[PDB]
Write a protein that binds this DNA or RNA. Structure first.
Length: 95
DNA sequence: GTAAAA
């Protein structure tokens, strides 16, 4: 019974260099992190903002403290990546 | 870089 594995152990594996655990950890939260940022960007660009937030989560996962919440730190990165995309198209009409 | 919980 159960999956025997939790999101906590998925995060420690990617700190050891096992990106295979991050791959299974991304697709899991890819549904939740996308529901957050779809509220700030249109559904035509939302999968591109979600993937940028995951590449930022990988390069910062070796700086993440496993002794803290994995999801609260994941959701904060995708919505902060969402504001920066709105600045990346907010200057789209400027010169 | 991102740290309440979603």
């Amino acid at each position: 019974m159960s999956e025997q594995l939790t999101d906590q152990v998925l995060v420690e594996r990617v700190q050891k260099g096992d990106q295979k655990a991050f791959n299974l950890l991304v697709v899991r939260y890819q549904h939740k992190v996308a529901s957050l940022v779809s509220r700030y960007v249109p559904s035509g660009d939302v999968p591109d903002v979600v993937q940028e937030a995951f590449i930022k989560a990988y390069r910062a996962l070796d700086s993440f403290d496993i002794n803290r919440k994995f999801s609260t730190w994941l959701y904060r990165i995708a919505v902060n990546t969402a504001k920066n995309y709105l600045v990346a198209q907010g200057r789209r009409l400027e010169l």
